[PDB]
Amino acid sequence: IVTALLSLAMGRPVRQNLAMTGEVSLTGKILPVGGIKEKTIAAKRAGVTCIVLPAENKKDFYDLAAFITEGLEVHFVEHYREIFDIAFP
Amino acid sequence: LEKDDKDAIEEKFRERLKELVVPKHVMDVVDEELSKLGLLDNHSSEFNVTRNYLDWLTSIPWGKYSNENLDLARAQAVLEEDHYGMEDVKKRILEFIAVSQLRGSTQGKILCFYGPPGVGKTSIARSIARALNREYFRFSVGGMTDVAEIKGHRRTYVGAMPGKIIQCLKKTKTENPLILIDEVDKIGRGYQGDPSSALLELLDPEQNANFLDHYLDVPVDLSKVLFICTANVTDTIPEPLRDRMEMINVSGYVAQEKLAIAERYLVPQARALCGLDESKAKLSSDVLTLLIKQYCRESGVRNLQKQVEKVLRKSAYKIVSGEAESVEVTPENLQDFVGKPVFTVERMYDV
Amino acid sequence: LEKDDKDAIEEKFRERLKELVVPKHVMDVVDEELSKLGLLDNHSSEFNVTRNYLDWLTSIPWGKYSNENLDLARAQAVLEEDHYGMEDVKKRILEFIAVSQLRGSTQGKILCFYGPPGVGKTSIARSIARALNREYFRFSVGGMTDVAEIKGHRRTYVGAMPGKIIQCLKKTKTENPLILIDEVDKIGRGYQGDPSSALLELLDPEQNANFLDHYLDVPVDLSKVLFICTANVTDTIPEPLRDRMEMINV
Numbered sequence: 001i002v003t004a005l006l007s008l009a010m011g012r013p014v015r016q017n018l019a020m021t022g023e024v025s026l027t028g029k030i031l032p033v034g035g036i037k038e039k040t041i042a043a044k045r046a047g048v049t050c051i052v053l054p055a056e057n058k059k060d061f062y063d064l065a066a067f068i069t070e071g072l073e074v075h076f077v078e079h080y081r082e083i084f085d086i087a088f089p
Numbered sequence: 090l091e092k093d094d095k096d097a098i099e100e101k102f103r104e105r106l107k108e109l110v111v112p113k114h115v116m117d118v119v120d121e122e123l124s125k126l127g128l129l130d131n132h133s134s135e136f137n138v139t140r141n142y143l144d145w146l147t148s149i150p151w152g153k154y155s156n157e158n159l160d161l162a163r164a165q166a167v168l169e170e171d172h173y174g175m176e177d178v179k180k181r182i183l184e185f186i187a188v189s190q191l192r193g194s195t196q197g198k199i200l201c202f203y204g205p206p207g208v209g210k211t212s213i214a215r216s217i218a219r220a221l222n223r224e225y226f227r228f229s230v231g232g233m234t235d236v237a238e239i240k241g242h243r244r245t246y247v248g249a250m251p252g253k254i255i256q257c258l259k260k261t262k263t264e265n266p267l268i269l270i271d272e273v274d275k276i277g278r279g280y281q282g283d284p285s286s287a288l289l290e291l292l293d294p295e296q297n298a299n300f301l302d303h304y305l306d307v308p309v310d311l312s313k314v315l316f317i318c319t320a321n322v323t324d325t326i327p328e329p330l331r332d333r334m335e336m337i338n339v340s341g342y343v344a345q346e347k348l349a350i351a352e353r354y355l356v357p358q359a360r361a362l363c364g365l366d367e368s369k370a371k372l373s374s375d376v377l378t379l380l381i382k383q384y385c386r387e388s389g390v391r392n393l394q395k396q397v398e399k400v401l402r403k404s405a406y407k408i409v410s411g412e413a414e415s416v417e418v419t420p421e422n423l424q425d426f427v428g429k430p431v432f433t434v435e436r437m438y439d440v
Numbered sequence: 441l442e443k444d445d446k447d448a449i450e451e452k453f454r455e456r457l458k459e460l461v462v463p464k465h466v467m468d469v470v471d472e473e474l475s476k477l478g479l480l481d482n483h484s485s486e487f488n489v490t491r492n493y494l495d496w497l498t499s500i501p502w503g504k505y506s507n508e509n510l511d512l513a514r515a516q517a518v519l520e521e522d523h524y525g526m527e528d529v530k531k532r533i534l535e536f537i538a539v540s541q542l543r544g545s546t547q548g549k550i551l552c553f554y555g556p557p558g559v560g561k562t563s564i565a566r567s568i569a570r571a572l573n574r575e576y577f578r579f580s581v582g583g584m585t586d587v588a589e590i591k592g593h594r595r596t597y598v599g600a601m602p603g604k605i606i607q608c609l610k611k612t613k614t615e616n617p618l619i620l621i622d623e624v625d626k627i628g629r630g631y632q633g634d635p636s637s638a639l640l641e642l643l644d645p646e647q648n649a650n651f652l653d654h655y656l657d658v659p660v661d662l663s664k665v666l667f668i669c670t671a672n673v674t675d676t677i678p679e680p681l682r683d684r685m686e687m688i689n690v
């Protein structure tokens with residue numbers, strides 16, 4: 001949502017084909033979230049290719065089958081600002 | 090056939106006892122019943138009742154034990170060959186046979202499964218029963234409410250017979266059947282006494298070894314049995330009961346291997362069901378990929394089965410009565426066969 | 441020996457069993473029940489119950505198979521005689537006769553109909569029964585909440601009778617009738633015992649083959665039956681039960 005708002009602010013479209021998720025706790029800290037397999041397969045199904053996830057779920061992202069994780073560049077992050085750099089290169 | 094007195098009615102029982110290795114406990118009871126039957130008249134309702142109850146005692150195996158398989162790979166093969174994946178259970182049962190093989194004598198444990206309906210939670214049971222070599226038995230409990238069904242009656246009533254479990258334990262002569270309680274989630278409640286409140290007495294891992302059914306009051310050890318339970322959501326079960334039995338989470342399938350199961354079992358299943366041939370009813374893998382990623386997205390497997398059989402059966406009618414001598418599904422044909430796409434490439438904004 | 445011997449009652453059961461081919465499994469149970477039944481004193485209620493039970497058990501057809509018509513032109517004729525349009529159901533049942541004819545032996549199946557009320561969903565069932573030549577037999581469950589009706593009782597209760605489905609198999613005297621469970625959409629769903637959790641043991645195609653109800657414990661085999669079900673709208677049907685059954689839409 002914050003990235004959405006920011007895109008409205010600058011008016012820059014968000015970078016094409018860049019999904020993202022995770023929770024944020026009022027100071028840019030990212031937080032873990034469950035259910036990773038469903039989001040993984042869905043993002044793969046939609047063709048989006050720059051998913052960014054909380055660092056805390058790193059382990060859980062790597063427990064998935066290699067073929068499922070083929071072709072999409074995870075960028076783990078802990079403080080929200082890095083995502084702000086990424087959405088707006 | 091005039092041997093209807095104490096000469097043969099008590100002989101056949103006492104000799105039938107011989108080969109079993111009965112616990113010394115119940116032999117006393119059986120002896121008083123024999124002598125009391127000896128003093129009883131051959132014709133009276135008391136006589137037939139006592140004789141009937143004695144027959145129910147003598148029928149029960151005491152220490153007969155079905156021989157169990159112990160080879161692993163021969164077990165693992167047959168456990169594997171008729172289902173894909175569901176790795177957890179195929180790993181768990183294998184560990185179980187390992188522990189049983191290590192410490193000599195046979196053993197039993199109680200466990201449960203849970204996942205979205207239709208994942209195959211119930212099909213696997215019978216395959217397991219053919220692997221371990223335990224005799225199979227099932228009895229759906231869902232929607233039952235009569236506790237007496239699983240505990241019998243007092244034997245002084247008219248039609249009292251022991252609860253269902255003793256029927257199971259006589260029907261399979263071994264003392265260690267693979268009982269399979271089913272659909273525990275949907276037991277009745279709240280209009281009479283909950284059968285669940287009785288179930289605890291069975292399922293205590295240790296205490297069950299002196300189970301005491303109301304009909305035949307003598308305690309019946311049955312610790313060696315291997316219970317199983319199957320609920321699709323592990324919340325409705327009341328907590329005190331839910332604690333006893335370890336859970337094992339089956340998980341919904343991913344498409345890439347939902348393909349490879351359907352391409353090995355389901356397709357041959359449906360083709361054998363409809364009686365067609367690979368010549369008459371060829372289907373490419375690619376149409377299966379399309380069908381999977383278009384018309385059916387879900388964790389279950391019932392849905393893909395329904396689509397596959399529908400496609401085949403439309404081809405079958407097109408053959409036996411229609412015009413083509415060999416239907417040949419191609420993606421272009423698919424709309425004709427299945428109907429119309431349901432899911433599409435939803436992307437509100439590609440830019 | 442005249443004067444109504446008890447062996448006459450035995451034998452009328454036996455003769456009733458001699459023709460129809462029972463599975464070997466239940467072939468024994470009747471034997472021990474008979475041998476016990478003779479020894480009973482006749483005035484005992486136990487004798488009444490056991491004899492009534494044995495009668496109930498011999499009554500079930502075992503492998504009686506009503507023969508099926510299969511010529512397709514006849515199917516078209518008897519369908520178009522009494523229902524216009526609604527071609528979907530027509531084509532589906534025609535595909536049924538096709539696949540059944542490719543594999544010899546008679547087969548069962550589950551289906552579901554749904555659409556606006558009063559389109560004739562009930563009448564077409566009877567027309568289909570006259571088309572395939574199976575017997576017909578309706579059975580409503582709108583609002584039902586006594587689950588025991590579908591599965592009888594322990595046989596020691598007074599007032600116990602085997603659940604309905606055994607009564608209908610006794611009535612149609614045929615292994616493969618065409619049940620018409622009706623108005624599943626309105627089926628009772630309360631604290632009193634939800635039938636919807638007991639129907640699943642019937643409707644699941646794979647495991648129904650050894651269905652058993654508590655009165656006469658021995659499993660029955662429903663695999664050749666062709667269920668049909670009706671509903672004004674899908675949404676209220678409880679989900680697991682909805683999942684089993686194919687869904688035509690008139």
Ligand SMILES: Nc1ncnc2c1ncn2[C@@H]1O[C@H](COP(=O)(O)OP(=O)(O)OP(=O)(O)O)[C@@H](O)[C@H]1O
Nearest residue numbers: 171172173205206207208209210211212213390646
């Ligand atoms: N891995 C699998 N291998 C083979 N068959 C499968 C598999 N998974 C599901 N099935 C098919 O699903 C059908 C029924 O599966 P099953 O009934 O075990 O699912 P379920 O979760 O038990 O649903 P429910 O408990 O409601 O019946 C079977 O016909 C079976 O072939």
Ligand SMILES: Nc1ncnc2c1ncn2[C@@H]1O[C@H](COP(=O)(O)OP(=O)(O)O)[C@@H](O)[C@H]1O
Nearest residue numbers: 522523524525556557558559560561562563564
């Ligand atoms: N196209 C049609 N062909 C034949 N009969 C029809 C048609 N449309 C309506 N009917 C009549 O509508 C009536 C509705 O009966 P019923 O099947 O009980 O409706 P529903 O089952 O939908 O409540 C039937 O008696 C039937 O003859």
Ligand SMILES: [Mg+2]
Nearest residue numbers: 209210211212
């Ligand atoms: Mg099941």
